[PDB]
Design a protein around this ligand. Structure first.
Ligand code: OGA
Ligand code: MG
Ligand code: NI
Ligand code: ZN
Length: 331
C-alpha cells in the first residue's frame, strides 16, 4: 500500500503533466496521496493563473463575516456576524490596519504558536464564499473555472442526468481568519489555489481515521452533538493541534503559499487559518473513486447546515433513503 503513514505529499508536475487534470489526480492517488486527506501541487514554472493582480480592488465582498469565538484557546466555536459590504481594496486596507494586521514573528512555527494562543481574543473579518474566478480565460491548465462538472461525472459514472451547476468561489482572508473542521459537501474533493498574499496553514485528518475526529468532537462539543448527528457540517468547531495530540488523533499540517494548489480528498477532515491578507479560489470536484464516498456521506438534517441548490440532486440520487429527512432540513 502506498503512503501507509498517510503523510501529506507534495507534487511538482511538469508542464506536460499539467495538461490533463483528471489524469494527474489519478497519478497522485496511485502514489498514495489521498491517504493523507490533503496534497500540495506546485505548478510548473512556465504556468501562471493570470498576468497580474493589479486590478482586483473593485471586486465586492457583499457580506463580510466577522468570526467571533467562544470557548477556550484550543477548543472553541465560531459564529459569523454579517458586516456591511466593502470592496476588496477596502478589505485589504482593513486587513493591514493596526487592529487586524499580522504581528511580528520569526517563522511560520512562531506564527502558528501565536495563532493558537491568541485567536479566541480577536474577531477577524473573512470575505468568504464569493462566487467568481480570478483565472484568466486563456489559462488552459488547472483553471478552476474550467473543470469537468460533478453533474457530468455522476452522469458519466452512473448514467443519470441531473440538474445543477458547479462554479468556483473566492475567499479574501486576513490574519486569524479561520476555517473550521469539516469535510466537503457530500464528501467531495476540493481544490484550492492561493492566488496572492500571505500563507494559509492547513491541518488534516486521514480519511481512514475521520471517525476518530468525529468521536472526539462529540466529546468536546457535547450540546452540539445532541442537537445534530452531523454537527461538523455546520462548520463552526475548532480543535488545536495540541488537543488533537493529547487525544491521540492522527493528523498532519502544512503551510500553503501564494502560487500553490491544495487538493482535499473525499472524507478528509481539514481546518486552518490565514497568516495575513490573501485571496484564494476553490471549487469542489469529483472522480470515479468519489462515488462510494458520496453514497456514505453523513448529513445534517437539523437545519443548520443549509447548502447549495446542486446538493439536492446528489442526495436524491446517491442517498434516496435520506432524501426526505435531509430536504426537510433544507426547507
Ligand atoms: O480557504 C478556506 O477558507 C477554506 N477552504 C477549504 O475548506 C477548501 O478549499 O476545501
Ligand atoms: Mg476590480
Ligand atoms: Ni474545505
Ligand atoms: Zn445539523
Amino acid at each position: 500500500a502506498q503512503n501507509p503513514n498517510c503523510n501529506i505529499m507534495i507534487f511538482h508536475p511538469t508542464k506536460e503533466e499539467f495538461n490533463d487534470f483528471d489524469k494527474y489526480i489519478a497519478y497522485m492517488e496511485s502514489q498514495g496521496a489521498h491517504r493523507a486527506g490533503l496534497a500540495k501541487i506546485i505548478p510548473p514554472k512556465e504556468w501562471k493563473a493570470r498576468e497580474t493582480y493589479d486590478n482586483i480592488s473593485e471586486i465586492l465582498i457583499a457580506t463580510p463575516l466577522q468570526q467571533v469565538a467562544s470557548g477556550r484557546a484550543g477548543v472553541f466555536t465560531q459564529y459569523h456576524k454579517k458586516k456591511k459590504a466593502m470592496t476588496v481594496g477596502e478589505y485589504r486596507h482593513l486587513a493591514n490596519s493596526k487592529k487586524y494586521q499580522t504581528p511580528p514573528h520569526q517563522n511560520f512555527e512562531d506564527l502558528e504558536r501565536k495563532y493558537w494562543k491568541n485567536r479566541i481574543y480577536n474577531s477577524p473579518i473573512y470575505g468568504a464564499d464569493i462566487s467568481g474566478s480570478l483565472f484568466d480565460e486563456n489559462t488552459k491548465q488547472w483553471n478552476l473555472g474550467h473543470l469537468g462538472t460533478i453533474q457530468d461525472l455522476l452522469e458519466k459514472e452512473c448514467g443519470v442526468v441531473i440538474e445543477g451547476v458547479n462554479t468556483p468561489y473566492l475567499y479574501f482572508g486576513m490574519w486569524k481568519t479561520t476555517f473550521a473542521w469539516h469535510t466537503e459537501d457530500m464528501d467531495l474533493y476540493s481544490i484550492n489555489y492561493l492566488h496572492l498574499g500571505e500563507p494559509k496553514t492547513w491541518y488534516v485528518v486521514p480519511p481512514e481515521h475521520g471517525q476518530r475526529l468525529e468521536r472526539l468532537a462529540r466529546e468536546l462539543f457535547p450540546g452540539s452533538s445532541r442537537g445534530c448527528g452531523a454537527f461538523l457540517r455546520h462548520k463552526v468547531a475548532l480543535i488545536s493541534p495540541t488537543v488533537l495530540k493529547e487525544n491521540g488523533i492522527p493528523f498532519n499540517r502544512i503551510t500553503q503559499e501564494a502560487g500553490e494548489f491544495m487538493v482535499t480528498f473525499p472524507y478528509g477532515y481539514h481546518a486552518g487559518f490565514n497568516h495575513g491578507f490573501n485571496c484564494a479560489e476553490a471549487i469542489n470536484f469529483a472522480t470515479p473513486r468519489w462515488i462510494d464516498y458520496g453514497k456514505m456521506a453523513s448529513q445534517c438534517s437539523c437545519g443548520e447546515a443549509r447548502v447549495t441548490f446542486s446538493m439536492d440532486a446528489f442526495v436524491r440520487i446517491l442517498q434516496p433513503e435520506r432524501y426526505d429527512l435531509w430536504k426537510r432540513g433544507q426547507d
